[PDB]
Design a protein around this ligand. Structure first.
Ligand code: CA
Length: 554
């Protein structure tokens, strides 16, 4: 019998934008804890929360200044415990975000580290001499300018792949690794059911920090995942920590080449249980990460196929169409125009809940929430956008207008707009002023209107989730794409123990025909979206309306 997490449905909560209960315009623990019935009624088994630790919030939780206290905005340790207690009451599990590629520069380790060259915490981080009057090498940072930042106190530079205020932690130092393990135990001893490892692939640094080649320079993300001790560190963590608990582990394997993913998730390797990969969510993103490249369904399905293949027999994939780091699912993979939004958010739901892997639903997608209509660069909270302005506008590579028009479609802030609960002031997210503006379409896209309506996107999510739970083939069954070259109609089977299901999803806003594989016939129709009528028992083909989806037993 396969583990519980292979057949669970996860939901991702970005606490900052989920539910505010005290008017500061920032979501919090009490807010999440109040919405657990909503989550439970949806069908959700397990929730992954974004970072909830003490932080200066230069990168909204991903710069942690104390790994053993909760973030002051979210509430208190007691609130957190209540959150756990309430989830347990409902038979739900918590996965937390674990952010140990870097800490905050306000962490006490970094404060001590930077204080002098000879202190017990110097090697908890990377400090290095400049070269030829400048940085130690040509590493760029994700968040703009150099990955190296000079400290006048010592004259040395420290490494930061992320923002200046997120110094990278030095995993080559045994005492630092040991501290990380003791920290992971402090959370696991409290009964957390899962841990999601932020940028898990960049823990290992290249010895000698040589320069990146001009090639490696255009794809720095990948270069940062090539550290030679990476897998030895992941194995040690497992042996010293995960072996002693029963929590599931999942890595954000950002920037790694797809062929290396099995090293992280082959269960025989005793590293991680599940992979978040980014081949799909970035399949139409340019190497600079702010332009987009036109792709088709054929690219979409071929990427999924490849990613499926690498899980193999002993590895396991999560599956996701959206997260706090990417544009909104229906906007990016669907068609969010008002006449197609609901139909294509339904079709993407069918995709999400029939993939082989553990699906993760990002807060708000079950309502068909969309990208935000940003109007000026000042509308972005996102430090990644500030970084693009620094790297591309101030250098004369692009104008402010070219940045705006492109990052409007790609920016993480599209995912971070407050969750749309009802059509009251600010979608009922807060009674104060939201930290990031609510999307005006809230008057038409809100949980209250959606739950009341059997034909809504929400109701469709709920129904799909019930179907998935009832049908083991749809979680753990094999996956086979009927026709990978087809750019109109996505279609594939899921099979387990003699039972085979067929999923067919029209990606065109026009009617289309689908012909079943020779000798395959529709036995039953489990569900359809945007269909006027189910096929007949024995059908050898299908007619599809714009954006129609369906799951059929064959
Ligand atoms: Ca609050």
């Amino acid at each position: 019998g396969a583990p519980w997490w292979k057949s669970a449905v996860f939901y991702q909560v970005y606490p900052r934008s989920f539910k505010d209960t005290n008017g500061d315009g920032i979501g919090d623990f009490k807010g999440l804890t109040e919405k657990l019935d909503y989550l439970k009624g949806l069908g959700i088994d397990a929730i992954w929360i974004n970072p909830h630790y003490a932080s200066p919030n230069t990168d909204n939780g991903y710069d942690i200044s104390d790994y053993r206290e909760v973030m002051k905005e979210y509430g208190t340790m007691e609130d957190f415990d209540r959150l756990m207690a309430e989830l347990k009451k409902r038979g739900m599990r918590l996965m937390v975000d674990v952010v140990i590629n870097h800490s905050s520069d306000q962490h006490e380790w970094f404060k001590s580290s930077r204080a002098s060259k000879d202190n017990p915490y110097r090697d908890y981080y990377f400090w290095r001499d400049g070269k030829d009057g400048h940085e130690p090498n040509n590493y760029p940072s994700f968040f703009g300018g150099s990955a190296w930042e000079k400290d006048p106190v010592t004259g040395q530079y420290y490494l930061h792949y992320l923002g200046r205020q997120q110094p990278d932690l030095n995993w080559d130092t045994p005492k630092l690794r040991e501290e990380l393990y003791a920290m992971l135990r402090f959370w696991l001893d409290k009964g957390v059911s899962g841990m999601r490892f932020d940028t898990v692939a960049t823990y290992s640094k290249t010895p000698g920090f040589p320069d990146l080649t001009p090639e490696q320079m255009k794809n720095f993300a990948e270069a940062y995942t090539q550290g030679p001790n990476l897998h030895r560190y992941l194995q040690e963590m497992h042996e010293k920590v995960f072996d002693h608990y029963d929590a599931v582990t999942a890595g954000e394997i950002f920037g790694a080449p797809l062929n290396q993913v099995p090293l992280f998730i082959d269960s025989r390797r005793k590293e991680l249980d599940m992979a978040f990969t980014f081949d799909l969510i970035r399949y139409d993103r340019a190497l600079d990460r702010w332009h987009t490249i036109p792709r088709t369904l054929a690219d979409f399905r071929q990427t999924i196929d490849k990613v499926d293949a690498i899980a193999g027999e002993y590895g396991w994939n999560t599956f996701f169409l959206g997260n706090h780091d990417n544009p909104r699912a229906v906007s990016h993979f669907g068609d969010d125009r008002p006449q197609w939004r609901e139909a294509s958010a339904k079709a993407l739901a069918t995709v999400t809940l029939t993939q082989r892997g553990t699906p993760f639903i990002f807060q708000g997608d079950e309502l068909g929430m969309t990208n935000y209509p940003f109007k000026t660069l000042q509308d972005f909270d996102d430090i990644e956008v500030k970084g693009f302005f620094q790297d591309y506008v101030e250098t004369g590579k692009a104008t402010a207008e070219e940045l705006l028009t492109n990052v409007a479609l790609t920016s993480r802030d599209n995912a971070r707009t407050p969750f749309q609960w009802d059509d009251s002031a600010n979608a009922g997210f807060t009674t104060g002023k939201p930290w990031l503006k609510v999307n005006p379409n809230y008057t038409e896209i809100n949980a209250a209107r959606e739950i009341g309506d059997p034909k809504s996107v929400y109701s469709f999510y709920r129904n799909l989730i019930s179907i998935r739970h009832e049908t083991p083939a749809l979680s753990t069954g094999s996956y086979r794409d009927i026709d990978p070259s087809n750019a109109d109609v996505y279609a594939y089977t899921r099979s387990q123990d003699g039972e085979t299901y067929l999923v067919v999803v029209n990606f065109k806003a026009e009617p289309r025909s689908f012909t079943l594989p020779d000798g395959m016939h529709i036995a039953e129709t489990l569900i359809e979206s945007s269909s006027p009528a189910a096929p007949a028992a024995g059908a050898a083909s299908l007619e599809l309306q714009p954006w129609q989806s369906g799951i059929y037993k064959v």
